[PDB]
Amino acid sequence: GGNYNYLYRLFRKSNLKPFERDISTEIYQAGSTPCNGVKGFNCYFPLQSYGFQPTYGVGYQPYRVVVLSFELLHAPATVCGPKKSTNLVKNKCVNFNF
Amino acid sequence: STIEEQAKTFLDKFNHEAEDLFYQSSLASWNYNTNITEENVQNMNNAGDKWSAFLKEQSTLAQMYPLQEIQNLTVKLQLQALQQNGSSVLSEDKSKRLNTILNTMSTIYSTGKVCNPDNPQECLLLEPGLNEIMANSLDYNERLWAWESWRSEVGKQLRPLYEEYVVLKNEMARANHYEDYGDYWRGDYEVNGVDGYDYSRGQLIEDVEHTFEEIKPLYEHLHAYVRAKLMNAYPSYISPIGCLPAHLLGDMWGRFWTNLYSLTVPFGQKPNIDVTDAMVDQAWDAQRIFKEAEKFFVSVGLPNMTQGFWENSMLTDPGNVQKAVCHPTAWDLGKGDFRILMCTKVTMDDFLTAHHEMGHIQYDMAYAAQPFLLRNGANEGFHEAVGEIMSLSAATPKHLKSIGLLSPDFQEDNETEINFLLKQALTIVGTLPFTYMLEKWRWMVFKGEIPKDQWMKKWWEMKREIVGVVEPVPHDETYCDPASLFHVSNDYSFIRYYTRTLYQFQFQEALCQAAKHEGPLHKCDISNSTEAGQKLFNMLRLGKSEPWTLALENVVGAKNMNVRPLLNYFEPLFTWLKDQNKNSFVGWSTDWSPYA
Numbered sequence: 001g002g003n004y005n006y007l008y009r010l011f012r013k014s015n016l017k018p019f020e021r022d023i024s025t026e027i028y029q030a031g032s033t034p035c036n037g038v039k040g041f042n043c044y045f046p047l048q049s050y051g052f053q054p055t056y057g058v059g060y061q062p063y064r065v066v067v068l069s070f071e072l073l074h075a076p077a078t079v080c081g082p083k084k085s086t087n088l089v090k091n092k093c094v095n096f097n098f
Numbered sequence: 099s100t101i102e103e104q105a106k107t108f109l110d111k112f113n114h115e116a117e118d119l120f121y122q123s124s125l126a127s128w129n130y131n132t133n134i135t136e137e138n139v140q141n142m143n144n145a146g147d148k149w150s151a152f153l154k155e156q157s158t159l160a161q162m163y164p165l166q167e168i169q170n171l172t173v174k175l176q177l178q179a180l181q182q183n184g185s186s187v188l189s190e191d192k193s194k195r196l197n198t199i200l201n202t203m204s205t206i207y208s209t210g211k212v213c214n215p216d217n218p219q220e221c222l223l224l225e226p227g228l229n230e231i232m233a234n235s236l237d238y239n240e241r242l243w244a245w246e247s248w249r250s251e252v253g254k255q256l257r258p259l260y261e262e263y264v265v266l267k268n269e270m271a272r273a274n275h276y277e278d279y280g281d282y283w284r285g286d287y288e289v290n291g292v293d294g295y296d297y298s299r300g301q302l303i304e305d306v307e308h309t310f311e312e313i314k315p316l317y318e319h320l321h322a323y324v325r326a327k328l329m330n331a332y333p334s335y336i337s338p339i340g341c342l343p344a345h346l347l348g349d350m351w352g353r354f355w356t357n358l359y360s361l362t363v364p365f366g367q368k369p370n371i372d373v374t375d376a377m378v379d380q381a382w383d384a385q386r387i388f389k390e391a392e393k394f395f396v397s398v399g400l401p402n403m404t405q406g407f408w409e410n411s412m413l414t415d416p417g418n419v420q421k422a423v424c425h426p427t428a429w430d431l432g433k434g435d436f437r438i439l440m441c442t443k444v445t446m447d448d449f450l451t452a453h454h455e456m457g458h459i460q461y462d463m464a465y466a467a468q469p470f471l472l473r474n475g476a477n478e479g480f481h482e483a484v485g486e487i488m489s490l491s492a493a494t495p496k497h498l499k500s501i502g503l504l505s506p507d508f509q510e511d512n513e514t515e516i517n518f519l520l521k522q523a524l525t526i527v528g529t530l531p532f533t534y535m536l537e538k539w540r541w542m543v544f545k546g547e548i549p550k551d552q553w554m555k556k557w558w559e560m561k562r563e564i565v566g567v568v569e570p571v572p573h574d575e576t577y578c579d580p581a582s583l584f585h586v587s588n589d590y591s592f593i594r595y596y597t598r599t600l601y602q603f604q605f606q607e608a609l610c611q612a613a614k615h616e617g618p619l620h621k622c623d624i625s626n627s628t629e630a631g632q633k634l635f636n637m638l639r640l641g642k643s644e645p646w647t648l649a650l651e652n653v654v655g656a657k658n659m660n661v662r663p664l665l666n667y668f669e670p671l672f673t674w675l676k677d678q679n680k681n682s683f684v685g686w687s688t689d690w691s692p693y694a
């Protein structure tokens with residue numbers, strides 16, 4: 001029937017900073033006429049709700065996006081990838097990395 | 099302060115809601131078309147009423163901008179598209195009267211009911227029946243009686259309605275910065291932007307008749323041949339000096355002469371190219387028909403249709419009590435949703451209809467990137483033209499043999515080519531003079547030059563002079579003959595049905611030059627021609643964002659509106675008719691009538 005639970009900002013006075021989030025619902029003032037928090041002659045809502053539906057075509061359907069940012073601040077490292085180990089052998093001159 | 103910067107914000111705010119609301123309305127309409135039922139009626143009601151009652155505010159607020167300073171051409175065009183107030187320029191009572199009169203004329207025209215005087219218990223409708231009796235029969239008395247009946251019991255009540263409709267519409271146009279209704283009809287066909295591509299309303303006015311004289315001999319040869327065939331069939335019913343009557347054409351209003359091809363067939367010995375046997379024998383269902391039709395589209399260069407169209411859209415067999423409309427339509431629901439609405443059968447006619455629908459889908463998806471107000475063709479004569487070009491290029495025997503739909507050992511010769519050319523001409527050129535005269539009469543009656551009383555006589559005399567159709571029976575002034583037509587009580591501009599064919603062959607001609615094909619234009623094919631697809635798509639993707647005068651430049655190199663390829667198409671027919679009407683004069687005198 002139409003999902004409108006996902007919204008996106010359409011208008012803002014200034015662009016977003018790298019890794020910046022704006023959640024304010026302040027009424028945008030497109031023109032020079034200020035508004036007291038209501039729509040008016042030149043005021044529109046910055047946020048718009050998508051209308052995602054299963055009948056929507058390619059390029060309009062919702063897509064779940066996750067961005068993984070890796071930080072290596074001077075603090076000691078905490079997260080590192082797995083390390084695999086082989087099988088041990090005995091009574092044979094070999095080299096090892098215990 | 100600013101007026102062009104906030105215009106962008108207003109346009110975005112309007113478009114964001116307009117797109118989804120139009121999607122909802124189209125979805126409801128499609129659902130009711132698939133589900134013809136009471137439950138889906140309120141769906142379209144609550145979709146359309148909401149769409150109108152929401153677009154009314156968008157139209158209302160789209161006047162606070164003084165549209166004489168916006169530098170951006172696209173923004174200016176978008177804002178002008180909404181700056182129009184529609185029919186809201188008159189008083190409330192005047193608007194209500196106009197709505198009531200349009201409603202009553204639309205209801206009246208769709209209520210054809212005439213009985214035979216001898217048996218007043220059997221009336222007939224415009225449905226098959228009354229139309230079928232006079233369209234497929236060899237008679238002169240009953241066909242003329244039916245022609246009178248549809249034009250007498252229905253043709254008398256349309257005159258008082260049309261008389262007030264014309265004056266009210268002209269008054270609305272005068273209040274709407276238009277001298278008459280004709281220029282409002284041509285308001286869309288007027289671009290005043292970039293230099294060298296400016297188009298005025300009067301340009302088409304004075305160019306339609308400018309290029310009309312060239313097609314006169316082509317129509318006259320066919321008219322003379324048909325009249326000679328009528329001598330061969332109807333004993334002394336038509337004067338060779340004059341011309342044939344109206345109802346004997348085969349159609350109620352003489353639009354098409356295809357139904358008269360049976361009585362005017364030169365060589366009926368050779369059967370017409372029909373692949374119904376080929377498709378039935380080789381087990382070609384509707385899905386196979388669509389699959390084989392899209393092969394030509396993908397070979398030309400048009401992108402293949404995306405997934406979802408084949409699923410959501412209905413294709414064939416409405417089947418059970420759940421009925422569906424069988425009108426071939428192309429649906430662009432928005433958000434990347436395209437659908438078809440067809441009742442496909444195993445028929446070459448349905449083959450060409452499917453090709454037309456695929457062309458419509460391709461052109462509709464061509465301008466997808468355009469904004470909501472610009473997701474349309476450059477003018478009104480491009481969608482149907484593109485749809486019919488594919489049908490023209492698919493009916494060629496060469497393509498049918500290429501797709502393995504014809505016998506590879508065919509022995510096609512000039513006789514069958516001439517027969518096919520004559521049959522195609524009887525459908526194409528048989529309506530162009532009628533279209534021209536109807537549009538000219540509508541332009542003149544909406545211009546107010548002809549008074550209220552001087553309506554029928556001028557129409558009849560100019561039909562006799564231009565088309566060459568005489569009155570089988572006398573008619574009085576109270577008859578409103580042009581009103582008894584589909585696109586006269588529905589407020590439809592009819593000039594659009596004229597230029598597109600003239601575009602078609604041009605495109606075809608260009609496609610012919612973009613085909614590397616040597617031979618006749620009717621056998622000219624763009625199969626396996628990628629350049630033909632790329633050149634077309636370069637303009638198709640533009641949509642209505644660009645002027646149509648500029649749009650008609652990437653396919654045909656001439657901006658001038660001249661009928662070059664129509665005569666080139668019917669050249670074998672013209673040279674055969676020159677050898678046909680050797681002892682029979684071509685033309686008519688407006689002095690002979692069946693009644694006098």
Ligand SMILES: *[C@@H]1O[C@H](CO)[C@@H](O)[C@H](O)[C@H]1NC(C)=O
Nearest residue numbers: 129133134135136137138420
């Ligand atoms: C069509 O409408 C009827 C009600 O008239 C309803 O029962 C049926 O479920 C509908 N079918 C679809 C496919 O929506």
